[PDB]
Design a binder for this molecule. Sequence first.
Ligand SMILES: NC(=O)C1=CN([C@@H]2O[C@H](COP(=O)(O)OP(=O)(O)OC[C@H]3O[C@@H](n4cnc5c(N)ncnc54)[C@H](OP(=O)(O)O)[C@@H]3O)[C@@H](O)[C@H]2O)C=CC1
Lengths: 50, 263
Amino acid sequence: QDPIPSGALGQKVPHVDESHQDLLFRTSHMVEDLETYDEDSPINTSDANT
Amino acid sequence: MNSFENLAQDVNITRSGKTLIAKGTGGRSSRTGYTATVFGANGFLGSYLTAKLAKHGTTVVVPYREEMAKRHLKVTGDLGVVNFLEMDLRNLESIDEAVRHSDIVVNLIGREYETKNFNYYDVHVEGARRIAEAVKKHNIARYIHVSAFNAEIDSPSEFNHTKGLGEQVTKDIVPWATIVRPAPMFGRNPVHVIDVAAALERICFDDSTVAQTFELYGPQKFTQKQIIDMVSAKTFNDLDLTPMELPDLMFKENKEKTFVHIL
Ligand SMILES: NC(=O)C1=CN([C@@H]2O[C@H](COP(=O)(O)OP(=O)(O)OC[C@H]3O[C@@H](n4cnc5c(N)ncnc54)[C@H](OP(=O)(O)O)[C@@H]3O)[C@@H](O)[C@H]2O)C=CC1
């Protein structure tokens, strides 16, 4: 419940909520870290291989 | 039910005086009453020709040279419609026999190369002289001689020269014969082949096409480079036909995640 999350330096880091795994947020180019949108969320799989 | 879109009427008289009455409605089982002899019906234009001609019931007399090229012409007509009898251009008696009972008769005997047996002079002017002398002998009405485009009487090419020679000889011996000159042909400017056969059947049967030379050329004129890039007198308007255009004829991630693959 904090206003500004810190990131081991004087930086702003994203507070990863449920709202970061969307079709808009899919395929935004970025380093392997500082990134959201895991490929394996229970909301992202959407009952795959059914 | 099928109608005679072939004919203009039901009772027709020919020129020689024979009375011909169409029976029933147009269709495969009926008989239009005309007897037609198509020289060269094994070939590429004659196939479409007596497809249209034996469709309604004109008794088509097919003179054949080889017994195997003629077989698919059996299924285009009813019982007794298409009739096969062998002939050779050389033997007079077979030409005499093939045009005994015909009302109309056409030749499309045309060969683009010399054989060891026939040169250009032998199949175009001289064979036509032969069979059209037989047509004059029997007084057959409506003789039609299909020729080539660029048929000049005197030309560097021997093919075109002899096509002009055949035209002049058949016009000399028979005055009532009609000679039609089509364009290049593309079945499957150039003209589509069903359009040439439709034009020829509309030549076949009406009056006031007699002793008239016809030019059958398509709508728009082409060059060979344009054609390969696409792959990669009286006209049609006499007989109420519009030929088809060559260009229109020319053709003639997530889901995979939610399917199953190893079962
Ligand atoms: N681009 C084109 O196609 C053009 C063609 N034409 C002319 O239109 C007519 C038909 O067109 P096309 O389909 O190309 O021609 P064909 O392919 O139909 O010519 C072959 C037909 O004519 C017969 N033929 C040739 N020589 C003889 C011969 N000595 N004795 C018996 N039969 C012979 C052939 O007999 P067999 O069945 O045994 O082979 C065959 O039936 C031809 O006269 C042609 O000159 C006009 C302008 C251009």
